[PDB]
Every structure is written in C-alpha cells, then in structure tokens.
Design a protein around this ligand. Structure first.
Ligand code: NI
Ligand code: NI
Lengths: 108, 108
C-alpha cells in the first residue's frame, strides 16, 4: 500500500521535514499535497504534473515547500504551527486516484 | 462562478431516479470521479471517467445503478432508502489543480 514517513517525525523548530512516499503506483500522472486529513482544493499546498514537470503552488503554500517527482514533500523551516496531518493524492494516468495521510510534529 | 452540484429532484420516491447536475465546470477538465459521501475517498468511489477516451471505471461503491455522462452528470436509478445522503464530484483538470463539489439527495 501507499505510505508516508515523516523524516524525522518529530523535528526541532527551524529545521526541515521530508515526507517520503513509498509504494507509489506504477502509472502516476501527478500529485497534490494537502494540509489536513482530506483532499480539499482550499488546503492544497503544492502539486506536480510529471509529463511537463509543472509545479503548482496552492493556497496553503508558504514558500517553504518542495515537491520532488516521486511525490516526496520537503518542508524547510518548520514552526509549531506545522504540526499536523498532511494528505497526498496521486492521480494516475487513467485518472483514477489514491490518497494517503500523513503526519508529523514539531518541538522547541 | 464555483463548481456546484444540483439534484433533480432533491426528494425522490423509492424506485425512481435522480440526476446529479454539475454547474460551472472548469474549461481545463480531463476527467471526473463521483464519490459516495462528502469527500474524495477511493473507497467510496462510485465511478471515474476520462473525457477523451470516454472510459467509465467503476469504483467500490458502484452498485450497477449509476451512470456518468460527459458533462459530469451522475444518474442513479432505482433508488433505495439507503441512497439518501451526500455525493461528491471531483473534476480532474490538465494542470491537476482539481475542484470538488457536493452533492445531496433524499429518498422517501
Ligand atoms: Ni450549467
Ligand atoms: Ni427521510
């Protein structure tokens, strides 16, 4: 199954968390990351379209986030307010999709 | 001008049918997914649709009574007491900056 690992899962304030994604499906078209536990356009952090490497900052972007291809999300410069859930939607080539969440915490 | 769902009729006799209309579809659309309930959740997927290939793909909530159309309308036939509730449409777009709307009807 599709999975997310916050590296580290408990991070000191001002450092960085990487959300690693395991078991991506084989046929991805692109990805969106969301703040919270569900897919909601109003809480979209960032996305990526593989065919043209288009990055798509959304309303929850804070100028700290980087989406790689593989779907991994790097958030630099974390604050106590970044503690919470993060949800990935992977849109496949056939436009079917998969969702996974997504947690980390931040101290100091 | 946001994506919005309209049911016709809202109040449906058992055994009759309901049509869920989508207003203000984005130009950029390439596909659709209709979900049972209030959110995008692959486990509640009724049916996905690719506009260009006119492929409908049933999800786990598909019950043999639901039809999707190229304007994203969802027709549900032969309704039961169990169908009362919410239905959520996601419109997938070529930039994957997707839009969602919900979606309600009631069976007496
Ligand atoms: Ni209309
Ligand atoms: Ni009732």
């Amino acid at each position: 199954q599709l999975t997310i690992e916050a590296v580290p899962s408990n991070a000191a304030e001002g450092k960085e968390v990487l959300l690693l994604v395991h078991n991506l499906p084989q046929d991805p078209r692109g990805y969106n990351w969301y703040k919270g536990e569900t897919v909601d356009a109003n809480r979209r952090i960032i996305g990526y379209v593989i065919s043209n490497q288009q990055i798509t900052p959304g309303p929850a972007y804070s100028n700290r986030e980087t989406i790689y291809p593989n779907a991994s999300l790097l958030m630099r410069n974390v604050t106590r307010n970044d503690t919470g859930s993060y949800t990935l939607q992977v849109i496949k080539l056939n436009l079917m999709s998969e969702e996974v969440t997504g947690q980390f915490s931040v101290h100091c | 001008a946001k994506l919005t769902i309209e049911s016709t009729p809202f109040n449906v006799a058992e055994g009759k049918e309901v049509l869920l209309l989508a207003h203000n579809l984005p130009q950029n659309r390439i596909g659709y997914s209709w979900y049972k309930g209030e959110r995008v959740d692959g486990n509640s997927l009724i049916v996905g649709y690719v506009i260009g290939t006119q492929q409908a793909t049933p999800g786990p909530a598909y019950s043999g009574r639901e039809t999707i159309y190229p304007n994203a309308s969802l027709l549900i036939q032969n309704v039961t007491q169990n169908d009362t509730g919410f239905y959520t449409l996601q419109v997938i777009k070529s930039d994957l900056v997707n839009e969602e709307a919900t979606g309600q009807f009631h069976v007496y």
